[PDB]
Design a protein around this nucleic acid. Structure first.
Ligand code: MG
Length: 821
RNA sequence: CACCCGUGCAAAAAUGCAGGGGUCUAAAACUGAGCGGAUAACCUCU
RNA sequence: UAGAGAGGUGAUCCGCUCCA
């Protein structure tokens, strides 16, 4: 987008009165080129200048890079920020005017630079991205007890990693009713039949059958996630602030359960790596009659699992496809062992390429990089494939004829006695040499879907890589960086980055218990509305697996009867897919086809039936999107809970936060609540004394003040409780009963929230504005665009977040829209 | 097609044109060759 | 016609490596 980024300007920093500029290095690193003080620059990195300064002035800098095509761009001097037309230049502050307090929190003192603030913001992003997935996981585990649904202070809410299971059992005989209820809730949870849906966490094999873990292990696994959620979404006090970063100091039981949970996939991958692929290696060694067997298994492990030496610069799969084309191996007879044949051929190609065919690989990579046209690309691929086939014709023939039918049985029954000394060097690390943070993260992802698992892992690696790059460039300048005593967890950022990269290689979705199949047939029976085939068809479906985890089957069955909701969601379906779906089971235009398909979906009944796939697909996508929309407000509430304490440390009289969470935006504005109402009216003088730069502008200050008078503490409290507990989705079958016409997922989610709020506040007196909002909601049969900004006011101090979270069209990145007024 | 900031030309104190922002939001990076993961769709054999 | 598995293919989102 920006021409400055294209020109190669990575970042612009300002320390003291001197300004440094960085450019992109190898990977995600950084390096200094230009330093400018008092419009006078001295070059650095003489060996390879990414860009050069055409002209220098106090206003800005002129650069022309060589990253790609010669592109000229102009960058702005950060020292002149906030000091325009308004001794008149200084290091820029934070938009929230909360920089010195954060710098004092994570470091000894203020550093008067603009790098540490970026590092702190990147650190905060870790908690910000952990909150959403932690609350999603805790919702997934809380989905149990669906039949006897109740809403109160839940068992998972009050879980802390202070008392072990030894002390927890003491509540069994205690006369205290409050603790008796908690212990009974835990006992009821431990006997739930649906626990098998997370067999990768609560189940362990025992000589062999999968069996339920011991009680203390289960309690530890539950309470770890519970405490993680409570710490990340709430605000701690005392020594519990630094729980995640002083994770090294738990009790023994949690360490043991983390070790046993994380070790099982490693044992299944590494310990029996020989046995799983024995039929392949035993013939590969025959093919390589003059190589070391230990080196061969080492190379096979490197290729198949870690892919450490892969990515040489061409698709080996395409090379194999072009090499085998036109030969007899495409025939149907070899289809039984076809996958093993491709694996052997690919490994042979790789091994030949890494050892001897190095110059050829380099030439192929250079030729691929030098050209752009696809015709030349495929011609070069075929040219290399012909030579490769000519060289390797005999070996693949040897592999193919040695992998026929009963010969595999003879291969399997025989034993093998390889030496494991050379192989263990490249083994992935066991649980004995793995940090607690990665173990806890892995335990967290046992309750997430594939998309969520990938997003979490990738964002974590990206953030840690950014932290490492900032640490390195901080080292380059020569300033102090050493963290405080209680925040030393980030000192070894490189170790955690490499560890997470290793973890990402083998992380997979949680496997499902074999014995749970009986429960599947009854649950899938109810999700199709067949009350007192399907098991063979839809149980294995991934949509069913990701729908049963995050939703009550009965509520999902009931919520599909709402015709407009189903009608809207299938609009995003590509034309070809729905066109195929329609004529598949129905026996003139796209819109009527969609409407008829939605009507057929709504009235699904039983007593050619390929319609089931579309129903599960649409249920899965709409539920996932509704969950994702709610995830944003969890982030906002977590940010509020952090910012109230940060501002209190800053010196502002924020006051109590839990009783009324509008206190944050009230303290920033300089207005104080009096006798239940905001007495003061708007005045321009109040804008100049805003606690942060966001509320300095008069118009948005007045808008926030006007909207604040229509907010109520009880409504905001209930909205907060609904957001954290996800009660809007948990009671979808009632809150979506009488919708008329939805226009986007934002509107659907907010209508759900409105209906929930109206349902609960039906028997309590309320002030006039809320009554007017309720009257508007019921008559229009759609979400009100004023209540949405009325109860979203606690995030008012962050004006940008306010606008994004209350204006339809500014909320979704993929669906831009117009702005009001 | 949101927010903030700088510069040059208009001032009636507020607009236009042209740029930057990991220190704004779920939110910093153009092209080419590849790796991994996740959800799909199509074809061929059983 | 609708119901198993394997292989391949045109498209999507996130991360990562190399060169310009
Ligand atoms: Mg940021």
């Amino acid at each position: 987008k920006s021409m400055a980024k294209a020109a190669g300007v990575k970042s612009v920093f300002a320390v003291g009165n001197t300004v440094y500029m960085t450019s992109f290095g190898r990977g995600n690193d950084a390096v200094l080129e230009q330093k400018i003080v008092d419009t006078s620059h001295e070059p650095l990195n003489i060996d390879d200048p990414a860009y050069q300064l055409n002209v220098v002035t106090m206003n800005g800098y002129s650069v022309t890079g060589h990253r790609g095509e010669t592109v000229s761009a102009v960058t702005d001097n950060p020292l002149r920020r906030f000091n325009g037309r308004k001794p008149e230049q200084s290091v820029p502050t934070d938009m929230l005017c909360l920089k010195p307090t954060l710098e004092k929190k994570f470091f000894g003192k203020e550093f008067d630079d603009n790098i540490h603030i970026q590092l702190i913001y990147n650190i905060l992003d870790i908690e910000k991205i952990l909150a959403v997935y932690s609350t999603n996981a805790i919702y997934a585990l809380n989905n149990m007890s669906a039949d006897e649904n109740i809403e109160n202070s839940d068992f998972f809410m009050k879980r802390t990693t202070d008392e072990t299971f030894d002390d927890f059992e003491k509540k069994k005989e205690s006369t205290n009713s409050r603790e008796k209820a908690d212990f009974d809730a835990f006992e009821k949870f431990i006997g739930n039949y649906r626990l098998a849906y997370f067999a990768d966490a609560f189940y362990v094999n025992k000589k062999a059958k999968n069996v339920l873990r011991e009680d203390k292990e289960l309690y530890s696994v539950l309470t770890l996630i519970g405490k993680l959620r409570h710490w990340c979404v709430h605000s701690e006090e005392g020594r519990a602030e630094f729980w995640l970063y002083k994770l090294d100091e738990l009790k023994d039981d949690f360490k043991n359960v983390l070790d046993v949970v994380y070790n099982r996939p490693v044992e299944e991958i590494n310990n029996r790596f020989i046995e799983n692929n024995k039929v392949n290696i035993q013939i590969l060694g025959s093919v390589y009659k003059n190589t070391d067997i230990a080196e061969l298994v080492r190379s096979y492990y490197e290729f198949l699992i870690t892919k450490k030496y892969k990515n040489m610069g061409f698709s080996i799969k395409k090379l194999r496809e072009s090499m085998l084309e036109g030969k007899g191996y495409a025939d149907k007879e070899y289809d039984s062992v076809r996958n093993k044949l491709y694996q052997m051929t690919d490994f042979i190609l790789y091994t030949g390429y890494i050892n001897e065919d190095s110059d050829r690989a380099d030439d192929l990579v250079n030729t691929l990089r030098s050209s752009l046209k696809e015709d030349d690309k495929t011609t070069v691929y075929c040219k290399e494939a012909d030579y490769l086939w000519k060289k390797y014709r005999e070996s693949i023939r040897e592999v193919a004829d040695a992998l026929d039918g009963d010969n595999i049985k003879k291969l399997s029954k025989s034993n093998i006695e390889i030496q494991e000394d050379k192989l263990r060097k490249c083994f992935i690390s066991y649980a004995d040499s793995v940090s607690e943070f990665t173990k806890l993260i892995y335990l967290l992802t046992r309750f997430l879907s594939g998309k969520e698992i990938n997003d979490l892992v990738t964002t974590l690696i990206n953030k840690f890589d950014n932290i490492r790059s900032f640490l390195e460039i901080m080292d380059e300048l020569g300033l102090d960086r050493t963290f405080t005593a209680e925040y030393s967890f980030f000192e070894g950022s490189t170790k955690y980055l490499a560890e997470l990269v290793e973890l990402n290689s083998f992380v997979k979705s949680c496997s499902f218990d074999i014995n749970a199949k009986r429960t599947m047939y009854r649950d899938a029976l109810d999700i199709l509305g067949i009350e007192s085939f399907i098991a063979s068809n839809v149980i294995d479906s991934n949509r069913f697996k990701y729908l049963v985890r995050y939703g009550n089957p009965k509520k999902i069955r009931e919520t599909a009867k709402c015709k407009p909701a189903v009608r809207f969601v299938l609009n995003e379906i590509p034309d070809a897919q729905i066109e195929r779906y329609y004529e598949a089971c129905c026996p003139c235009s796209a819109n009527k086809r969609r409407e008829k398909l939605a009507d057929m979906i709504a009235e699904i009944k039983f007593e050619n039936q390929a319609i089931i796939r579309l129903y599960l697909t649409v249920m899965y996508i709409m539920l996932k999107n509704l969950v994702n929309v709610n995830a944003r407000y969890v982030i906002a509430f977590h940010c509020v809970e952090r910012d109230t304490k940060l501002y209190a440390e800053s010196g502002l009289e924020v006051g109590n936060i839990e009783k009324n969470k509008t206190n944050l935006t009230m303290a920033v504005m300089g207005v104080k609540l009096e006798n239940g109402i905001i007495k003061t009216e708007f005045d321009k003088s109040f804008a100049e004394n805003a606690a942060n730069r966001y509320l300095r502008n008069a118009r948005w200050y007045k808008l926030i003040l006007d909207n604040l008078k229509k907010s109520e503490r009880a409504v905001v409290n209930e909205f907060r409780n609904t957001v954290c507990h996800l009660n809007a989705i948990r009671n979808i079958n009632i809150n979506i009963k009488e919708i008329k016409e939805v226009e986007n997922y934002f509107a659907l989610y907010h209508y759900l929230i409105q209906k929930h709020l109206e349902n609960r506040f039906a028997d309590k007196k309320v002030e006039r504005d809320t009554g007017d909002f309720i009257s508007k909601l019921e008559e229009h049969k759609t979400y009100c665009k004023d209540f949405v900004k009325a109860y979203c006011t606690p995030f008012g101090y962050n004006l940008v977040r306010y606008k994004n979270l209350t204006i339809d069209g500014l909320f979704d990145k993929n669906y831009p829209g117009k702005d009001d007024s």
